Design a protein around this ligand. Structure first.
Ligand SMILES: COc1cc(Cn2cnc(N)c3ncnc2-3)on1
Length: 167
């Protein structure tokens, strides 16, 4: 048993809810919250800016030190950093950004990072402002992630369609 409430069960291991990932993280304090990161860990908007704002910019301060030491992530890659006041850990995962021209095939690689964690609270990778179709992102998630993932979908209308079209 765990603390996640009101999720629809899609598969053995994937659950979904219409919710802001920030409000869910603040209420649940999960072991792992996933950030929809970019390779520079510049958290300006979308899930990254919302999460970073909720940490009072501590996520960005920590991220800038990570980049100064290690250099940028890969598209499809990830790093584990603090979850600050939201979670124990934040898994920063870089899905491909269609609005920058990146290979959508890298979305599977991105979701493979989730398999290193038994339970995660996550957004739909590469969806929202990253330009991919969230229906596609959900399908790749279900077909790639084997650990237990609780997906928070901010947008009510896209959430309604993601459920109603799920195969
Ligand atoms: C346009 O539709 C969208 C966009 C997104 C991405 N996203 C953005 N900011 C949030 N605070 C989220 N929490 C869950 N997902 C979040 O979700 N649905």
């Amino acid at each position: 048993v765990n603390s996640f409430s009101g999720y629809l069960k899609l598969t053995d291991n994937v659950y979904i809810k219409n919710a802001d990932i920030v409000e869910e993280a603040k209420k649940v304090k999960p072991t792992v919250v996933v950030n929809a990161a970019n390779v520079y860990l510049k958290h300006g908007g979308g899930v990254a800016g919302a999460l970073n704002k909720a940490t009072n910019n501590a996520m960005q301060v920590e991220s800038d030190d990570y980049i100064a030491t290690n250099g940028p992530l890969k598209v499809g890659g990830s790093c584990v950093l603090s979850g600050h006041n939201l979670a124990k850990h934040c898994l920063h995962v870089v899905g491909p950004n269609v609005n920058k021209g990146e290979d959508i095939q890298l979305l599977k690689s991105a979701y493979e990072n989730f398999n290193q964690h038994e339970v995660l609270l996550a957004p739909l990778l590469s969806a929202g402002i990253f330009g991919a179709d969230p229906i596609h992102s959900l399908r790749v998630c279900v077909d790639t992630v084997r650990t237990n993932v609780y997906l928070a979908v901010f947008d009510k209308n896209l959430y309604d369609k993601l459920v109603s079209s799920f195969l």
